[PDB]
Amino acid sequence: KVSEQLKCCSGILKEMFAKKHAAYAWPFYKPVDVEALGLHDYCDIIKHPMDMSTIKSKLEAREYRDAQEFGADVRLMFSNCYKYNPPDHEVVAMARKLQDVFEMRFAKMPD
Numbered sequence: 263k264v265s266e267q268l269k270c271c272s273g274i275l276k277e278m279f280a281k282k283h284a285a286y287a288w289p290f291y292k293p294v295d296v297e298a299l300g301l302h303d304y305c306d307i308i309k310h311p312m313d314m315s316t317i318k319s320k321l322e323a324r325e326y327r328d329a330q331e332f333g334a335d336v337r338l339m340f341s342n343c344y345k346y347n348p349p350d351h352e353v354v355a356m357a358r359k360l361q362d363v364f365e366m367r368f369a370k371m372p373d
């Protein structure tokens with residue numbers, strides 16, 4: 263049951279990586295490369311960076327005890343984007359499209 267919700271989480275993350283969503287999901291695939299992007303204030307603003315590849319590693323390492331812990335890291339990834347960037351920034355629009363994909367499926371988690 264907890265195992266079953268974690269399988270749902272693995273399926274959700276797999277969809278977030280699917281080519282269908284790549285046009286807006288790709289900025290979230292990997293840790294933000296603050297040095298390559300020139301984001302010299304990023305570590306002053308974001309205390310706990312998170313990205314889809316790290317979430318994938320933690321799922322395989324069994325670091326999430328249940329779906330709520332998984333969901334928290336996904337929401338942290340999005341919240342980090344909304345916190346760091348101006349609300350009209352293009353990457354915020356991309357976060358919103360990816361968060362729609364996540365939330366709609368996360369809401370179908372089995373009881």
Ligand SMILES: Cc1cnc(Nc2ccc(C(=O)NC3CCN(C)CC3)c(F)c2)nc1Nc1ccc(Cl)c(NS(=O)(=O)C(C)(C)C)c1
Nearest residue numbers: 288289290294295298299300301342343346347352353356
């Ligand atoms: C998860 C995440 C959260 N916040 C931000 N913020 C941010 C905010 C701004 C700049 C930016 O200013 N980049 C300059 C613009 C052109 N230059 C030649 C150097 C890089 C910036 F890169 C990132 N990014 C994230 N990921 C991310 C990963 C890779 C890339 Cl390439 C980008 N670039 S982006 O945001 O400009 C775009 C996706 C709309 C094209 C973003």
